[model samples]
Target chain A: MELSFGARAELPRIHPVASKLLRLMQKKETNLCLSADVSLARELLQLADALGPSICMLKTHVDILNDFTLDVMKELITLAKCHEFLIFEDRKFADIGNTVKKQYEGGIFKIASWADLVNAHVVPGSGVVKGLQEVGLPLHRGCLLIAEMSSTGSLATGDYTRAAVRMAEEHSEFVVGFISGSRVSMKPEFLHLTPGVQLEAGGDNLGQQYNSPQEVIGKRGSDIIIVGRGIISAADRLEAAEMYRKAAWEAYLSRLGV
Target chain B: MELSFGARAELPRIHPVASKLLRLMQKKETNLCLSADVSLARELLQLADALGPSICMLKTHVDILNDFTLDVMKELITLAKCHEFLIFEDRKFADIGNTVKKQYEGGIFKIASWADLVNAHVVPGSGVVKGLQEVGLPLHRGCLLIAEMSSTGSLATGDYTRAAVRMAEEHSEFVVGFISGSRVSMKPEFLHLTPGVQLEAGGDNLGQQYNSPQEVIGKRGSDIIIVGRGIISAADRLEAAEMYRKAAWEAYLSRLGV
Candidate 1:
């Protein structure tokens, strides 16, 4: 049961002859796309120009983008198409089945109307997949099953924990990318995006936690190391990003025993 | 394990209150704290005055409130208090425990800081109670648990479903208020609050399914009937509400065999 089927765009999974032209300012050997330097869409293009060969994908939380107007979003779409970089919207939507449809299709954000890959929660019900399927978008609208949250004193440990991990796997439409801990193993094809990868363990004054890119990629075996602060909050962003890129590549090759 | 140990507010079970209020508004017996009439909250105080006899609580989705600024919210709060009515914020927040804490305590609503009662989802974990405790809100700031959902192919199924019921029961801070269907049953201490209560069994293309207030209270044995469109959509909301009130009281008495 998919929690969001209507969010699925009607287009075929594979782009045929690539109707959208994504520009590629940078291409890294590893698949670790760090959302550093460029937060809003405009800055992302500028960041791409500045830091090439250090990122594969550029993750963004569109809600936080101050300049996220409709035109801006449209430009983002074109830029992503041209950049040869995949766009991921970090909106962890958790709602009832029908509400899921209404929010994505008719309600706010109308994310299904735009973003390629979107994050959804299975708290309400994984069955909402029908809503996504109706739209015919690629199942890559990754259902980041919140297997284990990165927050302090989180409820993930208790018996009452509600998440999409295993259940999301059962759904045909979901591209499984669980928000889990290092202990949780990944299903070969499933993408395991680990957040809370702290360069240090303590939370910031604002209460944001972090994990080092090296530790996340190497020790944690994370598919996507979500470095919210390590890169964004760093004093020297570009240098910090290079360190992350180097660590990420070394970790990837090491993991494969290459 | 118990996430944290601290004194907190008694979780206010909303179902019982809703049921009692609906019964009072029924023309067959009495009309005390009146409910206002309106299709949406924006219908102004006029509609509320019309159905004023049938309501004791003003349930609202703050995000949906078009004109609900700080001043408006404060005014509404004052009005509700002056009229001997309570305000219910139906925002089933499903976020990280820490973030939820900040949102509840620091945000504009500051629900945890001042609301007589509030609603939250136990999605992230049972640690929710801990976060609530940290805020020092009343134990029953109306922590209405969503035991079940009103939709098609919902996730409250099978084992995890049963687990949710158990978790709510064991939590010392709140009594079990199952958002169950007419078919579900629980112990008396664990109250049932059924939404989608209406004279008819359909919804306005939005798929918000409904069961008559009388039928749901009688068959499902609910303590509260949350009617959204049934009264809001009616030509004469007061008259419609009076009918519902009578039905609810009669049903309650019948269940008690009084």
Candidate 2:
């Protein structure tokens, strides 16, 4: 896919680290971000090792591990470096500024110190984004403001999403983009990371809904596709990741009318 | 405080676990919940060991501990049992139903299995509460909805807070109540857990504001007062806790005109 200067102009407005991530995505010829939601340390490492090369980012819920150790964390970081992918910690911080700061910096997870990108709920308002920026900026970290979710009964739409977008625009320095299910009517500079992408699965017994990679990138014009169970729970995770990467890439190219 | 049967009747409507928590609070003669936001497991244990007897609950940001281990968790649980206080894990989960389920059940934290009461953001709508309920109900776990936050420039008020309250009411079986600033205008069956209670510190530079125990329960009519830095950061955590406990108990009596 070829980039236009006009399309590239807004990259400067995004956080430097986020711009680097976009560049890495383009160079890797993939925009698939694997949601490595495994609970065991060994399984998380195995998935990261097998599928890391085929994706641009490895998203984690680090707090959920049953055998979380510094060694596992170091290995994950090494895998990201070896595979040339970013580490996005899915810690949806929604507390007050001070508490959120403690959560980001003071926790055993210590998310702000390592994660390239983190997401948060804007329900606590701009102070949440601002507080995160204060911790994330000096570390060259970026944030994906949760504008919308792909759940069956998501309230993160309409006015709530618009307000979230407005908050992101105000703090574009540390705010990289958004996590939305549909194409957001915001500045093209900010990325749109759409979750719930799956091919075989329709929806879970739970209230989760899945959309095709084409639907997310082609129909919704999202910049990145986040796939969890579709990849993580697959019999062959590496092969599954390759399939998703190709599907998502082709969808992106088609979306750009390339 | 004098009981109003009409208001008291709602207590049974709450989940059995939450009812147990309220009963414990009454028997303990205190409603003070200490927010032990320390970073080391040893300090967390020290605080719990010393002040656990004075407070009805000891709140924790468990992920923030640098020395977190299974042994430490076992000790903390032992302390809770010995002190007769409940455990409230302030995870503030804000993911989709499926993802939140993994976070609650599958993570290293495995919050649903242990935490007496957990809290979540209503940003993703009722699906989040429903997902937590699915995992928590079998475990007899309860949840506190984030109706309002006690932070400067919080967006969790007005229509948004009302919407949160409505969601809690809809799922009152698993959702015990709310983590609100002031009293929420909901069914009396729901409990109100107000954070940001401090006796000395006014507010943090990062936008955390404080309300006295009297202000939270006496003025706002909140069901429980959650004090963090006031006790945990004190030179004498145990003594500070006793002071806050007495103040909170006296304020509750006055509020009820008892």
**Number of the top-ranking candidate, with DockQ as the measure:** 2
Tens digits of per-residue lDDT for model 1, B145-233:
66576665455555545655665666535433455665344444454566767776675333346677667777766655666667766
Candidate 2: RMSD to truth:
2.8
Q: What is candidate 2's local distance difference test score?
A: 0.81
Superposition error at A201 for model 1 (Å): 6.0
For candidate 2 chain B, the 10 contiguous residues with the lowest summed lDDT are B1-10
Query: Evaluated on chain B only, what is the TM-score of candidate 1?
Result: 0.76
What candidate 2 gets wrong by more than 4 Å, as runs, is A1-10, B1-11
What's the C-alpha lDDT at position A244 in model 2? 94
What digit string (tens of lDDT, one per residue) describes model 2 on residues B1-258?
A: 346323353465756766676677777777888888888888888888888778888888777777766677789889999988888899898887877877888666677666888899887778888888889988888899998988776767778788888898888789988999777854767778889888765888767788888888889888778888787777988899999989888887787773
Worst 10 residues of 2 chain A by lDDT: A1-10
Quote model 1's TM-score: 0.65
